[PDB]
Design an enzyme around this catalytic site. Structure first.
Site, PDB file in Angstrom:
ATOM      1  N   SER A 197       0.837  -1.201   0.000  1.00 28.90           N
ATOM      2  CA  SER A 197       0.000   0.000   0.000  1.00 28.90           C
ATOM      3  C   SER A 197       0.878   1.260   0.000  1.00 28.90           C
ATOM      4  CB  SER A 197      -0.992  -0.041   1.170  1.00 28.90           C
ATOM      5  OG  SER A 197      -2.037   0.896   0.990  1.00 28.90           O
ATOM      6  N   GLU A 324      -9.624  -4.762  -3.038  1.00 27.36           N
ATOM      7  CA  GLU A 324      -8.843  -3.714  -2.388  1.00 27.36           C
ATOM      8  C   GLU A 324      -9.716  -2.652  -1.710  1.00 27.36           C
ATOM      9  OE1 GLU A 324      -5.704  -4.070  -1.978  1.00 27.36           O
ATOM     10  OE2 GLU A 324      -4.603  -4.565  -3.778  1.00 27.36           O
ATOM     11  N   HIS A 437      -7.602  -5.644   1.333  1.00 25.62           N
ATOM     12  CA  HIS A 437      -6.396  -4.832   1.324  1.00 25.62           C
ATOM     13  C   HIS A 437      -5.495  -5.206   2.500  1.00 25.62           C
ATOM     14  CE1 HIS A 437      -4.246  -1.353  -0.191  1.00 25.62           C
ATOM     15  NE2 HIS A 437      -4.229  -0.788   1.006  1.00 25.62           N
TER      16      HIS A 437
HETATM   17  O1  4VV Z   1      -5.729  11.157  11.408  1.00 26.96           O
HETATM   18  N1  4VV Z   1      -5.622   9.813  10.780  1.00 26.96           N
HETATM   19  C1  4VV Z   1      -6.720   9.007  10.623  1.00 26.96           C
HETATM   20  C2  4VV Z   1      -7.976   9.347  11.003  1.00 26.96           C
HETATM   21  N2  4VV Z   1      -8.303  10.523  11.561  1.00 26.96           N
HETATM   22  C3  4VV Z   1      -9.616  10.516  11.816  1.00 26.96           C
HETATM   23  C4  4VV Z   1     -10.107   9.336  11.427  1.00 26.96           C
HETATM   24  N3  4VV Z   1      -9.095   8.585  10.949  1.00 26.96           N
HETATM   25  C5  4VV Z   1      -9.430   8.120   9.597  1.00 26.96           C
HETATM   26  C6  4VV Z   1      -9.027   6.670   9.368  1.00 26.96           C
HETATM   27  C7  4VV Z   1      -9.780   6.133   8.147  1.00 26.96           C
HETATM   28  C8  4VV Z   1      -8.808   5.692   7.058  1.00 26.96           C
HETATM   29  C9  4VV Z   1      -9.372   4.459   6.349  1.00 26.96           C
HETATM   30  C10 4VV Z   1      -8.687   3.210   6.891  1.00 26.96           C
HETATM   31  C11 4VV Z   1      -9.667   2.045   6.985  1.00 26.96           C
HETATM   32  N4  4VV Z   1      -9.012   0.745   6.690  1.00 26.96           N
HETATM   33  C12 4VV Z   1      -8.446   0.714   5.467  1.00 26.96           C
HETATM   34  C13 4VV Z   1      -7.185   0.273   5.570  1.00 26.96           C
HETATM   35  N5  4VV Z   1      -6.937   0.054   6.858  1.00 26.96           N
HETATM   36  C14 4VV Z   1      -8.043   0.369   7.552  1.00 26.96           C
HETATM   37  C15 4VV Z   1      -8.114   0.237   8.884  1.00 26.96           C
HETATM   38  N6  4VV Z   1      -7.042  -0.228   9.584  1.00 26.96           N
HETATM   39  O2  4VV Z   1      -7.177  -0.369  11.169  1.00 26.96           O
END
Ligand code: 4VV
Ligand code: 4VV
Ligand code: NAG
Ligand code: NAG
Ligand code: NAG
Ligand code: NAG
Lengths: 532, 532
Positions: A197, A324, A437
């Site tokens: 990724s 994905e 993914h």
């Molecule tokens: O600041 N950094 C992040 C965030 N801030 C607020 C909310 N949050 C957003 C995270 C959502 C991103 C999508 C990820 C979901 N899926 C896909 C691959 N891995 C995933 C989970 N892994 O546990």
């Protein structure tokens, strides 16, 4: 002593670890950079000052400061990706797994973790390099890099926060491997960088960036490529997002010096809490702080670099997973839930495509919808759900990768392409998400060899095949055994465009991976949006 | 006498004709209009002055002045459509086939010939109404109308050449049927108008035009509808083409009066020779002189009329053939020949789509190409040829008809839809052309009942089914027999959108005729071209 290694930075003391009824050496938490704390925050990484005495390299280091997933507390599916160590800005360390007895000069593999440039750890269970190091007799390194604003805040022109410093973190670890892996029995002229990724995109970015090329031999890209629409932003957009981050934390916004000073004063978790507020659109598969096309790390636009052959010419092994998009729809799209089959209505499908193609106008959205709708059975919940899964996957991972591979193959010295479509038997995510993914990683790192994790016998066999493909490629530039009786993974060529499935079944060769959809995403839709 | 009929226009003497080992009455070449010769050229039709004495109605009349196909001299496939009588501007006649003994008041069917509004005859062998009149005991009328510039030259504002006069020719014949068919044993309150292609569009135009509606009961549309992109032009475009026709014949172009005078002086064949020079684009399936949206015959635009329900509410039976486009590609597209399989290369495919979608910009052409290309097998000659056949058919006949049927069904009183996909066993055109435009007509007019023409037994059976569908519908508004043991042709509804195949096999019901492609042609592409 076998666990005592003398490097150019100083002496290092490792630990001996059990692996599948045997033992190998482990050198964990080796610093390759000065701690990027205080006024060093957002700054380019400085090399670690050499140390006297023996560095204790027997335990995992801290993970870099990042967002923590709390959507399903206790659930292993989501918490296997969360940091499993205390978080700290002092996180620039690397981990080395060395076969026992120590090799003289053997193949080196360097893992670059994913996590959308906003998260990730080298210390995860699924990234444990001991199985791959033992089984394939390779020296396995896993680096770390600053993520989120800490690693990718970009105010172009300023030298205090220039952007791309997370990429430079990776580079300096590659530099340290180049300079020091010989003392651990690794061959510095046979280093493969590999990642998934964001890590896959990172790998591709080191292929492109002139400053990075000489520091590795070959490359493996998993479910990511440098030209991904989520993997980079313009300098202006990076600037905009950094200013907006300051606006969220009540910063003085009169100059870069005022802004950077304010952000350096804020505790790590204060930046993380408001991080996602800077995204310009209501979107999925987009991340706030990512690499910038800065004119330095990337001399010109990625596309012009790809077209003119401005990149490192070597062998690449790359590929994608069947589904994905599912992970991102679950977390951010209406109608998707962890504990239901998530049958999606037309209204939710239409909401999905919007979230999912942020930079599109109404005509663009209509084009995508038409391309992925069976108008004979348009109220089919399964078809709407799977169609949306395909949209997110195709637009963000597969078609960008397919564009990269096709461009690279013109000038490269050998390409090998895979399509990983085996759904693990022991997988805790719901059925509808399919081949998710990041769920080839466990097969790459050899977790199915451990009985306690409850894989099938055929999944162990697949894992051994994949590991041997990865390691033979790292060694030779070819995943195939020279004079072997096993069916050959064919070379990807401009003409034939051949690839293999990667599953528990007997190998099948196909051609033109998802070409119907990727001609839409790479040729037609860009023409449509540019006209309108 | 059975062959002597007294009408409001005068007495008429018919002829007795053999039909399938029996006999019926035939009244051929009955005038319904004053000859449109001299200063009457381009003018609205005037009603035929009543005559004293007995009109000789025993032989076919003259065909209207038209282009004659000479591409394959002697070949029956092309010459079955050519005029089989001497051509003349004095061609406004009708033909009536009457069962023997004469009926009192029976169902009437009125045939309106096709030929792209530039050609056609009522006197063709495939339009012989004696078989349908005999087998189904209907009174069959075939009208004629002025074609080409003679029937459709349009200088809006002028009363000497207002346009649409060919449509008014048809109307006056329908008026004559209304007024006089009672004396031939026909029921004036049970008249079905039916036609193919341009005749099918004509039928639909009489449904729309307020001046035409009261003159018939029900309607059958074969491979044509009023909203076809080839079936009408704007007043400005009509004006432009008439001026350009004058430019081709060295006319004084200072006013309409100067222009019309010049054109009325030119021999018929002088107009025909330069007719095709006025087309604005390099195109197929486009014809120079066609109906105009004039504000009179059509009060507003066809689409707004269809949307607001401004049309005659009755029952309609309509449908299409499998391969509507092949006839036009053969005649006008590079790579297509009569005596080869016509395997088309990418270059010829791309030439095809351009010829074939004249009013499209480059983005539009790319959209069509993407929609009809298998990008896994793009050099397949058969797939490129059949794809192009589908493009021409879908864009010109099927999708326009599917838009009409869907709009009409909202306000109409019963719709029946067919898909004719039987390829005749005894057909002289090459295999690749498939089920060709206009080759259901022979089954509608019952030619397979004649042994000498060399149809199969199952083709005779199909013909009898079709004729009985057509005639039962004409009689009742329903092609089905009330309490019959035969499988029912279901009603087309807004919700279910059901239709039947029409072939030698047992009836199959499907839904949503070519919806995937027609959503492209009716919803997406129009949005694309309007934006760009
Ligand atoms: O600041 N950094 C992040 C965030 N801030 C607020 C909310 N949050 C957003 C995270 C959502 C991103 C999508 C990820 C979901 N899926 C896909 C691959 N891995 C995933 C989970 N892994 O546990
Ligand atoms: O002035 N009027 C006509 C012409 N002028 C110059 C040339 N010519 C053009 C005739 C081409 C029209 C395509 C028709 C081919 N296919 C399709 C259906 N029927 C066809 C043949 N029937 O014999
Ligand atoms: C290194 O660290 C571990 C745990 O912190 C400790 O148990 C071990 O004794 C250490 N070994 C040394 C300093 O030799
Ligand atoms: C790779 O490069 C070598 C040496 O320059 C060349 O001989 C070989 O053909 C190349 N292989 C491919 C697949 O391009
Ligand atoms: C009508 O015309 C035909 C052929 O022109 C002729 O043979 C026939 O005798 C005519 N019949 C009349 C005028 O009664
Ligand atoms: C047609 O109209 C009649 C009488 O107005 C009505 O009773 C009947 O339901 C209609 N049929 C359809 C199919 O709309």
């Amino acid at each position: 002593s076998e666990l005592l290694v003398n490097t150019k930075s100083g002496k290092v003391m490792g630990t001996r670890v059990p692996v599948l009824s045997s033992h190998i050496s482990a050198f964990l938490g080796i610093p390759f950079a000065e701690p990027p704390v205080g006024n060093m925050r957002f700054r380019r990484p400085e090399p670690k000052k050499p140390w006297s005495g023996v560095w204790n390299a027997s335990t995992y280091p801290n993970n870099c400061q990042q967002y923590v997933d709390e959507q399903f507390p206790g659930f292993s599916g989501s918490e296997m990706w969360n940091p499993n160590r205390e978080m700290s800005e002092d996180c620039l360390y690397l981990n080395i797994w060395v076969p026992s007895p120590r090799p003289k000069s053997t193949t080196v593999m360097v893992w670059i973790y994913g996590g959308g440039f906003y998260s990730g750890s080298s210390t995860l269970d699924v990234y444990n390099g001991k199985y791959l190091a033992y089984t394939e007799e390779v020296v396995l390194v896993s680096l770390s890099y600053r993520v989120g604003a800490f690693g990718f805040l970009a105010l172009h022109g300023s030298q205090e926060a220039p952007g791309n410093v997370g990429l430079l973190d990776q580079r300096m670890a590659l530099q340290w491997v180049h300079d020091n892996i010989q003392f651990f029995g690794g061959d510095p002229k046979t280093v493969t960088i590999f990642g998934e990724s964001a890590g896959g995109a990172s790998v591709g970015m080191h292929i492109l960036s002139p400053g990075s090329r000489d520091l590795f031999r070959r490359a493996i890209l998993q479910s990511g490529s440098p030209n991904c629409p989520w993997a980079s932003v313009s300098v202006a957009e990076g600037r905009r997002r950094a200013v907006e981050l300051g606006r969220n934390l009540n910063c003085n916004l009169n100059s870069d010096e005022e802004l950077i000073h304010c952000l350096r004063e804020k505790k790590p978790q204060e930046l993380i809490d408001v991080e996602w507020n800077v995204l310009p659109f209501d979107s999925i598969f987009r991340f706030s702080f990512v690499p910038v096309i800065d004119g330095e790390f990337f001399p010109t636009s990625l596309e012009s670099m790809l077209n003119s052959g401005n990149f490192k010419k070597t062998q690449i092994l790359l590929g994608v997973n069947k589904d994905e998009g599912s992970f991102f729809l679950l977390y951010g799209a209406p109608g998707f839930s962890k504990d239901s089959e998530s049958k999606i209505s037309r209204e939710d499908f239409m909401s999905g495509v919007k979230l999912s193609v942020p930079h599109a106008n109404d005509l663009g959205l209509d084009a995508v919808t038409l391309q992925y709708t069976d108008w004979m059975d348009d109220n089919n919940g399964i078809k709407n759900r799977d169609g949306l899964d395909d949209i997110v996957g195709d637009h963000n991972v597969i078609c960008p990768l397919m564009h990269f591979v096709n461009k690279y193959t013109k000038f490269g010295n050998g390409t090998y392409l895979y399509f990983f479509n085996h759904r693990a038997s022991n997988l805790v995510w719901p059925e509808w998400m399919g081949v998710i993914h990041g769920y080839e990683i466990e097969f790459v790192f050899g977790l199915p060899l451990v009985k306690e994790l409850n894989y099938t016998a055929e999944e162990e066999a697949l894992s051994r095949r994949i590991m041997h493909y990865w390691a033979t490629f790292a060694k030779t530039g070819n995943p195939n055994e020279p004079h072997s009786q096993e069916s050959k993974w064919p070379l990807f060529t401009t003409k034939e465009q051949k690839f293999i499935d990667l599953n528990t079944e007997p190998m099948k060769v196909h051609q033109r991976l998802r070409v119907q959809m990727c001609v839409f995403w790479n040729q037609f839709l860009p023409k449509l949006l540019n006209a309108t």
